Design a protein around this motif. Sequence first.
Motif, PDB file in Angstrom:
ATOM      1  N   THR E 103      -8.195  24.077 -30.274  1.00 26.04           N
ATOM      2  CA  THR E 103      -8.303  23.889 -28.838  1.00 26.04           C
ATOM      3  C   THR E 103      -7.535  24.986 -28.100  1.00 26.04           C
ATOM      4  O   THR E 103      -6.797  25.778 -28.691  1.00 26.04           O
ATOM      5  N   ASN E 104      -7.728  25.026 -26.777  1.00 25.78           N
ATOM      6  CA  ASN E 104      -7.124  26.081 -25.968  1.00 25.78           C
ATOM      7  C   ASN E 104      -5.603  26.075 -26.061  1.00 25.78           C
ATOM      8  O   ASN E 104      -4.969  27.123 -25.897  1.00 25.78           O
ATOM      9  N   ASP E 105      -5.002  24.917 -26.321  1.00 23.85           N
ATOM     10  CA  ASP E 105      -3.561  24.827 -26.515  1.00 23.85           C
ATOM     11  C   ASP E 105      -3.149  25.026 -27.968  1.00 23.85           C
ATOM     12  O   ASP E 105      -1.956  24.934 -28.273  1.00 23.85           O
ATOM     13  N   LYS E 106      -4.106  25.298 -28.860  1.00 28.87           N
ATOM     14  CA  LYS E 106      -3.838  25.529 -30.282  1.00 28.87           C
ATOM     15  C   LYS E 106      -3.077  24.359 -30.903  1.00 28.87           C
ATOM     16  O   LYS E 106      -2.187  24.545 -31.736  1.00 28.87           O
ATOM     17  N   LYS E 107      -3.432  23.142 -30.495  1.00 30.44           N
ATOM     18  CA  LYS E 107      -2.761  21.940 -30.970  1.00 30.44           C
ATOM     19  C   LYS E 107      -3.620  21.076 -31.879  1.00 30.44           C
ATOM     20  O   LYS E 107      -3.075  20.375 -32.734  1.00 30.44           O
ATOM     21  N   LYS E 108      -4.940  21.109 -31.719  1.00 26.42           N
ATOM     22  CA  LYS E 108      -5.848  20.306 -32.524  1.00 26.42           C
ATOM     23  C   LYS E 108      -6.916  21.195 -33.144  1.00 26.42           C
ATOM     24  O   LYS E 108      -7.259  22.252 -32.607  1.00 26.42           O
ATOM     25  N   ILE E 109      -7.441  20.754 -34.283  1.00 22.71           N
ATOM     26  CA  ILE E 109      -8.431  21.517 -35.034  1.00 22.71           C
ATOM     27  C   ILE E 109      -9.820  21.043 -34.633  1.00 22.71           C
ATOM     28  O   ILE E 109     -10.139  19.855 -34.746  1.00 22.71           O
ATOM     29  N   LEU E 110     -10.649  21.973 -34.160  1.00 22.32           N
ATOM     30  CA  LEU E 110     -12.001  21.647 -33.727  1.00 22.32           C
ATOM     31  C   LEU E 110     -13.043  21.875 -34.812  1.00 22.32           C
ATOM     32  O   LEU E 110     -14.110  21.252 -34.772  1.00 22.32           O
ATOM     33  N   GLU E 111     -12.766  22.750 -35.775  1.00 24.24           N
ATOM     34  CA  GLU E 111     -13.738  23.141 -36.787  1.00 24.24           C
ATOM     35  C   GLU E 111     -13.210  22.835 -38.178  1.00 24.24           C
ATOM     36  O   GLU E 111     -12.088  23.223 -38.522  1.00 24.24           O
ATOM     37  N   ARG E 112     -14.022  22.148 -38.976  1.00 27.67           N
ATOM     38  CA  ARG E 112     -13.784  22.060 -40.404  1.00 27.67           C
ATOM     39  C   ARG E 112     -14.281  23.337 -41.080  1.00 27.67           C
ATOM     40  O   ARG E 112     -14.812  24.245 -40.437  1.00 27.67           O
ATOM     41  N   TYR E 113     -14.096  23.409 -42.399  1.00 23.26           N
ATOM     42  CA  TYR E 113     -14.692  24.511 -43.146  1.00 23.26           C
ATOM     43  C   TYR E 113     -16.211  24.426 -43.112  1.00 23.26           C
ATOM     44  O   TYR E 113     -16.897  25.439 -42.929  1.00 23.26           O
ATOM     45  N   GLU E 114     -16.750  23.218 -43.264  1.00 25.64           N
ATOM     46  CA  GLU E 114     -18.187  22.994 -43.244  1.00 25.64           C
ATOM     47  C   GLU E 114     -18.797  23.163 -41.860  1.00 25.64           C
ATOM     48  O   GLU E 114     -20.015  23.338 -41.760  1.00 25.64           O
ATOM     49  N   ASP E 115     -17.996  23.113 -40.798  1.00 29.20           N
ATOM     50  CA  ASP E 115     -18.470  23.425 -39.453  1.00 29.20           C
ATOM     51  C   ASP E 115     -18.448  24.910 -39.151  1.00 29.20           C
ATOM     52  O   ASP E 115     -19.391  25.424 -38.548  1.00 29.20           O
ATOM     53  N   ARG E 116     -17.389  25.616 -39.559  1.00 31.17           N
ATOM     54  CA  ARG E 116     -17.399  27.071 -39.471  1.00 31.17           C
ATOM     55  C   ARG E 116     -18.563  27.653 -40.259  1.00 31.17           C
ATOM     56  O   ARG E 116     -19.282  28.528 -39.766  1.00 31.17           O
ATOM     57  N   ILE E 117     -18.774  27.159 -41.481  1.00 30.16           N
ATOM     58  CA  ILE E 117     -19.870  27.655 -42.306  1.00 30.16           C
ATOM     59  C   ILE E 117     -21.214  27.334 -41.667  1.00 30.16           C
ATOM     60  O   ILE E 117     -22.122  28.172 -41.654  1.00 30.16           O
ATOM     61  N   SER E 118     -21.367  26.124 -41.124  1.00 29.54           N
ATOM     62  CA  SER E 118     -22.628  25.758 -40.484  1.00 29.54           C
ATOM     63  C   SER E 118     -22.906  26.626 -39.263  1.00 29.54           C
ATOM     64  O   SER E 118     -24.041  27.066 -39.055  1.00 29.54           O
ATOM     65  N   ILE E 119     -21.885  26.878 -38.442  1.00 27.37           N
ATOM     66  CA  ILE E 119     -22.071  27.701 -37.249  1.00 27.37           C
ATOM     67  C   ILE E 119     -22.422  29.130 -37.637  1.00 27.37           C
ATOM     68  O   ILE E 119     -23.317  29.749 -37.046  1.00 27.37           O
ATOM     69  N   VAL E 120     -21.732  29.678 -38.641  1.00 26.66           N
ATOM     70  CA  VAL E 120     -22.022  31.039 -39.081  1.00 26.66           C
ATOM     71  C   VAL E 120     -23.429  31.122 -39.664  1.00 26.66           C
ATOM     72  O   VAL E 120     -24.150  32.102 -39.442  1.00 26.66           O
ATOM     73  N   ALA E 121     -23.851  30.090 -40.398  1.00 26.66           N
ATOM     74  CA  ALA E 121     -25.198  30.073 -40.956  1.00 26.66           C
ATOM     75  C   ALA E 121     -26.255  29.997 -39.864  1.00 26.66           C
ATOM     76  O   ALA E 121     -27.284  30.679 -39.938  1.00 26.66           O
ATOM     77  N   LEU E 122     -26.027  29.160 -38.848  1.00 28.56           N
ATOM     78  CA  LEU E 122     -26.967  29.072 -37.737  1.00 28.56           C
ATOM     79  C   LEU E 122     -27.038  30.380 -36.966  1.00 28.56           C
ATOM     80  O   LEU E 122     -28.114  30.761 -36.491  1.00 28.56           O
ATOM     81  N   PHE E 123     -25.909  31.075 -36.823  1.00 34.63           N
ATOM     82  CA  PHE E 123     -25.935  32.400 -36.213  1.00 34.63           C
ATOM     83  C   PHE E 123     -26.737  33.378 -37.062  1.00 34.63           C
ATOM     84  O   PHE E 123     -27.533  34.162 -36.535  1.00 34.63           O
TER      85      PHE E 123
END
Lengths: 86, 287, 287, 683, 683
Positions: E103-123
């Motif tokens: 998040t913008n405050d760098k306090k919570k995690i928005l992306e799992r590994y499987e979400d980063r991978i999914s987003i990169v794959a969709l790109f």
Amino acid sequence: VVLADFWAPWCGPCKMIAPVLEELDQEMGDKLKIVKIDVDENQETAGKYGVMSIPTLLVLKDGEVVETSVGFKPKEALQELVNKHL
Amino acid sequence: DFTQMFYNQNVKQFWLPEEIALNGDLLTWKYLGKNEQDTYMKVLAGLTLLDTEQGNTGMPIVAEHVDGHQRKAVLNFMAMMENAVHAKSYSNIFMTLAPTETINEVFEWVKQNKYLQKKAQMIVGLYKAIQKDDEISLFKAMVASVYLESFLFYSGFYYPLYFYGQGKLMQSGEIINLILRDEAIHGVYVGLLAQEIYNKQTEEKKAELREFAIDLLNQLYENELEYTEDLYDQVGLSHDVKKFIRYNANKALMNLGFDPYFEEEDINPIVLNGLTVEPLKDDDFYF
Amino acid sequence: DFTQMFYNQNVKQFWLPEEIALNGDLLTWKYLGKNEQDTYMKVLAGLTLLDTEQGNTGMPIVAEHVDGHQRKAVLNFMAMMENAVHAKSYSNIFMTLAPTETINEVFEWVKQNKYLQKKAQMIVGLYKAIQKDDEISLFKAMVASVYLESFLFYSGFYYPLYFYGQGKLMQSGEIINLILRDEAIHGVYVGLLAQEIYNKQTEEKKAELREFAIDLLNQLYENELEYTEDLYDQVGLSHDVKKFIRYNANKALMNLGFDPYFEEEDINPIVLNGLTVEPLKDDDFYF
Amino acid sequence: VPKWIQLNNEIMIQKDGKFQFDKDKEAVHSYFVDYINQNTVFFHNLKEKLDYLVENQYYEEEFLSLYSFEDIKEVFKTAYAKKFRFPSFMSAFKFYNDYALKTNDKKKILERYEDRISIVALFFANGDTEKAKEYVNLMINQEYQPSTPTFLNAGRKRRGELVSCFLLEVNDSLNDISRAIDISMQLSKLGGGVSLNLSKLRAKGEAIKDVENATKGVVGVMKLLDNAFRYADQMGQRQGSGAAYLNIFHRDINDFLDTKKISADEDVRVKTLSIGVVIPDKFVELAREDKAAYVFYPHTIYKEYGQHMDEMDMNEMYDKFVDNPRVKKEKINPRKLLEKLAMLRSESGYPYIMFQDNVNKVHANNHISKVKFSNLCSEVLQASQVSSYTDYDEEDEIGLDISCNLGSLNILNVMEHKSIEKTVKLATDSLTHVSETTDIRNAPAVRRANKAMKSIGLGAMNLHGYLAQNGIAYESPEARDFANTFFMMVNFYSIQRSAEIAKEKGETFDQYEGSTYATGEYFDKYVSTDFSPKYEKIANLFEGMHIPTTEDWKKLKAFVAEHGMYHSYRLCIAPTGSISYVQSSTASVMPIMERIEERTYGNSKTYYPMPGLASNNWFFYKEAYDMDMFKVVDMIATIQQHIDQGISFTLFLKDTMTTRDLNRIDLYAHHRGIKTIYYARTK
Amino acid sequence: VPKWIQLNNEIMIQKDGKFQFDKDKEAVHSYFVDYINQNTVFFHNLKEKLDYLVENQYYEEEFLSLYSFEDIKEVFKTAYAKKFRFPSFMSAFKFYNDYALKTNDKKKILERYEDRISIVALFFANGDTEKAKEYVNLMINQEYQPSTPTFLNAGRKRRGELVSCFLLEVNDSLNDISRAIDISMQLSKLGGGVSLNLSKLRAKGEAIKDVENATKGVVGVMKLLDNAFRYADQMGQRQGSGAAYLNIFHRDINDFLDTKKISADEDVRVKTLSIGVVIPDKFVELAREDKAAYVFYPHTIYKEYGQHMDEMDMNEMYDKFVDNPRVKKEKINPRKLLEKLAMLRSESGYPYIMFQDNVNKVHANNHISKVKFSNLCSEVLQASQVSSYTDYDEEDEIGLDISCNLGSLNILNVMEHKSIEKTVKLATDSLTHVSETTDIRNAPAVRRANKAMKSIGLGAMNLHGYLAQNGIAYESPEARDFANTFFMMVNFYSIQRSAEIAKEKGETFDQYEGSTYATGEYFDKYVSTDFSPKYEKIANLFEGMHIPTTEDWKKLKAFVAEHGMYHSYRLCIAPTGSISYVQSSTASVMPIMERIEERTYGNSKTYYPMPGLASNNWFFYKEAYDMDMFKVVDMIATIQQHIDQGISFTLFLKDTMTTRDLNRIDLYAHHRGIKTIYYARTK
Ligand SMILES: [Mg+2]
Ligand SMILES: [Mg+2]
Ligand SMILES: [Mn+2]
Ligand SMILES: [Mn+2]
Ligand SMILES: [Mn+2]
Ligand SMILES: [Mn+2]
């Protein structure tokens, strides 16, 4: 009774133990066999014994490891280590 | 590996009291409250008294027992700075700000003060206990010296730096900053000499010397907290001074090659504002 | 009546060998005979030894036993000059003019030279014989120090001065003149402290102290003659240097408040030629 | 030692208690006869010399092609008909060491004084023989002195630019900062000094594309500019000199000043970048009442209001910024900042102090832009518009960047010849020609503003020399009266020549109609107040010259209203440094620093008495450090009211005078209408 | 201390004389359960997560719009169908500290590994659901790792560029130098490392338009670029890293090398500019024969021949330069210069040694240009053309500046899945997509070369990890045989995929017809030599995989001749020191530095055992410092023959070895065909 030396050509302490093992063979070579194994060429044996540093000296008796010594040792300390198992 | 480098840094930092004109401090001194003037006087006397011990005993005793001509020369230079430069500088600041009778009374008070005496005598005790050809006793004294140079002075330095960072007492603050800069390098240098002794010891002896250093630090630190409240509560600064003591304790430990003892803390921003060739022989181009 | 003016004079005379560039002597050095270069190296090495012990031992030990913070500050400053400035300057000269092997050899030569070892043994022995609160042992060491400052250095100083006076080795010579200027004031100052102690004694005790001083001078003198011949015979100057050391022996005696002991002689004229932040207020914004 | 240098050293050898000032003329004679006449290349005729110089790429051919050889020969005869003789050895030494053309091996001398002056005049006239002869008479009489770039490089192929200054507006973008670095280097390779306005750059800890605490402030841009000027060091013959200006209400003002501290670390310190501070009247008001001030983050203001911080009147918008929660700022102490400025100027002479409201109170072109910053010499005060340099293959929005077309009047020689009008008009024409012929391709905003504003700088020098040689003390009210009359005359004739050029060309400067010249507001004090001398002694100095009256100023105002004005700016008093020796003049309108200058050249010690110095006027040539700085401020403010741009005002401080004294001088300068303060020279 | 760190601290706490390697799995489990799951914000459905991330400026809405929500949902499901579990604590820690979206405050995690991978794959897929799932399977199996810029910034709005590195050619002009500084700052703002070729810059003491001895050499440009990279240092997230490359025959080579000396003064010392030295075979020939060599002044060569010094063949033109009186040069000792290089690498690790003739002897695009320099990691060896940036309002002659889109194969995971062909082809497609979607408006040459060359970088990693986990010593001939076979297959399938892309799109890279791919010279050694494993143990590793034979290479050569090649460059092995942790892989094809890396993140030390390190394979994971560097050179040269670009070859040296040993390793690398040498690490 076998003194197995796990060594490598790049290991400084392993070069220091080499002459100590030659003197030990001259004094005790009728009752003690000395075996050297190069870990760089023989990784399966070094892995089997759970060796994880060099120099490593294993005292084996009838195929079983009875004592383990890590790092450099003077002759008198190796004689004491082997004489326990003769 | 280090003495000639420290020689250079020491001699190039040479300075004299006369270089800073002090009289213009009276233009801000007159505007301080009684508690501020009282704290400043007491802090100044504390620094003066401790630095005199370092000039008369601490540096000369270490120079006496350390072997090496170049080390003895650097140590002599440091002793000179204590006695010829720092001591005259503290006297000059006092004579500028207070009349003779006030100076005599402040020194009488600080001379009787329990917390100043406790630390002064603890340090001096270790210097007096050095024995000829005994590197363990020398090391203990070096630890004491590093603690004085890099730690014990800083409960005192805080206040002049605090004013200096605000635009008050700028001439005496400049002097204090030069003194502090000398004590910093003194602490680092003596620290390296102590580490040399420490590194010559067995593992059991090392653990024993570490325990000595931490135990000594603890005794001095607990007395510093009391010293701090005694001087700074009347001007409301003790909380921030305590952070500054711990930060400097950590520097002293690092000078002795030890890990920091205290967690990292931010410091008051006003005080911060104050602060083997082998030649190619051919046959190497062919394989 | 005198310490403050000596303090001011000592600190105003402060210098470092690096202030003097030495590469200008390279050619006049190259042009000297092997005998001349040998004598020159050895002469400066003998001086280096004397300053090493004066800085490491002599000045710090006298500082320890003399009472008064200002007297101690002067003596500490003089000690620093001995080993941090004077002794080091000789290495600057050596490193410029000579290859490392010649430098190594001359330092080995000081260790084995019997006259240099004897004079060090005698002087340092007296320094180390000082007993706390014993003014007589202190006087004896101060006499030894005056003899080192004002007499013993001069068999060494002769040769750089002899060259300087002929327009040779003038950068090295400039360093030596600065060293000599320092030793002259060091000898006077220590002389005055010695006289203080002497003047406290009974007439009977004074008579014994004069005997000590004269016996010591003669013993040092006889050794210095042999040292002088050993160094200067190969350059043809031994008789001339002997006249110079006798001249300076008289100056040492005078620094101690005693009458001259040797008759006056003509010294080589070449050697004689060798010698604010004011803040704003509300009224500065209206005119 | 050389014979001329040895004779020059006899100036200080005192006989009968008096300096041997007559030895200086002997020094000039010896210098010429023994060095110059021997080492000047002499040709059988002027034709051979001109052919040699053009063919060997010493002169440009285009400017000489506009004249037949008869015209050039007549011009050179006019230059040599005067039989000009240097009256001091230092004048000839300066000219024949710096400005005289030498061969490619520097062994010989190709140009005399009468040759450089003739070439400069031929360049100025642009094909006119009579105008060239008029320029030759103007310069060989030493009435007018073209600036060092113009005098040096006029008509020479191996040159830089004739422009002395470059004032660049740096917008708040990485593309704009990169273009600022590029333009700074491209203008430093031309020779002229470059000044940059960094007040638009957002402060340290600002956001770069919605990520916070990302900027490193204007200090990083100053590092880049300093290394850019170091790289463009002009062979190292003259080190690359650049200025950076920042508004005092910019958040980075403390870090901006911290770079000139001696104690500053090498990680923040800048060396080749001079710094100036722009102080609006609001800061002085805040300091006066001893109330807490605020330094604002420029990008927050730009986001909130859509306009840059330095484009908004701080006297009006300071409260709006303070009570705006979306505008970021930190409390500061204005009096502490003033004391910091005073101690920084005492320690290093920096920063230049620019009183923005003093500049903009009488700025004629406020409609174009308010004067946000000054030049490297802290004397040019012109309207500038920032350029929005966009990404590649995108069209850039080109603004206005200021340039120096400088020239100096020698007040002594101007008033001895009783030719204020003729000298001012000819100097204005020459500066107009210099501005027109300047075409800088690598600086788009500089070129656009040179074409549009057509601004020139006509300064004056030898004020103290004229006053002392006429028995007038610099601090005396008679000196201020003379300066008032002389500079009112200069302004009158500069405005008249600008209007005449506008009439003859049919064009004014761009956006002239909004200027106070068109509205008549500029001429209010000139049609309401008489600037004729109030002293009989001063009035006798102007005898034989028609002093403009109130009615004359009314006629000039009507003429300007009907015909317009060709130059946006006309008058600016540069420091007039090394070229002041050649003209045998005191530097600028400043008082003399020392009566006899002690200069070191090679292994020799050279002495330069100020021109006209003798026993009778020894005390009239009072040293600048001995003067009262308040009366010097009065003198400059008297001059400043007749100069549309600023004056390079250097403060001459004694060692005993503290920072409070410097602050008092600064605040009195602000109170008296001084626009800029150049240097704090401490003795 | 955190529980996960304490459990990870139990690795070195030896029980029964063995390391507790099983504690790392416990450490990662504790890390997840106690920090990651607790600090991961969860949404009721994927629709809410995607809406929140798009609306809050976390994701680009453009790349997610080409897929219907059911397609994205099924891509995420097939990403979580793997149920990927991190094998080590350091992998998860590095991912969730460096790459996972917060998040913008760098306090919570928005992306799992499987979400980063999914987003990169969709790109990567760009509207193809099946291709997106193929990319998801590729990355979740960890067979292919996109470069850190690509993995971190694909599909994100707060992003820089997806290109990891840029190579700029600096021409010999002030306009070109200023534009190079501008482009360096622009690309450092984008986050990518910038390498600059300074060999075209004229030497120190050269002439600037008839003004002789005016240049500052390349060192002034190094200072400018160093301050540019310090200024554009990505706000402090990671210090701006730049590279300067100079030919060893440049006159400034000693001044270029002296910038990295510790004794060098701050006026000549650079701090953020990595330096690289380009060594032609002529320099090695001169050093071998001990003849005195000459470094040349580039501007003299340009004036005499019309081409820059680095644009001509050194081996052919050296004697002509030496025999040319018009080419200025200075005499150097090539062996002394080699010893200076060795001592500089021993003391600081610089410069990057680039053997130009080792690159250009097997360079396929020598017709476009020779490879004159490498990147910041000394692995991007591509043809580049210098851009002639002209004055403002003048059209610039835009050349080719190298842009490198990097991607890494996990050799362990690629080989365990028996999916060399599919992984290489999918990685080539992803790199092609990254190159296509990347545009850079502020670098005309980088953009032009990205559009025309379409060069990509497909690296490899976990070579030593795969060998040790298979009981193969990195220095053993079996390891070199495996590297030969594996990288021959990688090259085969990369060429096949490039030809297939060229066939599908109907277009090849610009100037493909002149390349060795079109003429068939590239495939000569492949249609002549069989690269199948020579050891039965190695051949058993490639079981179930079709090893390209000589006939298959002939068919591929015919296919390339018929259809062309889409990418000018395809393979380049980057160090990949950061993403190696996440993929549980050894960095690059380099041998491991340490068996158990000791890292301090905060006040706690975090041990990282090597991927797959255990008791049975302890002595197979032999540390790089204990290994024979000649054997490592042999390994890299075996790999390099199948890589068209370079390899980041780091030299791992012991303190016992001298500068002669370093020179011997350098010369053995040159003799064995090593193209570039990255670093000289000393233990
Ligand atoms: Mg922008
Ligand atoms: Mg060019
Ligand atoms: Mn002290
Ligand atoms: Mn100290
Ligand atoms: Mn001495
Ligand atoms: Mn002495």
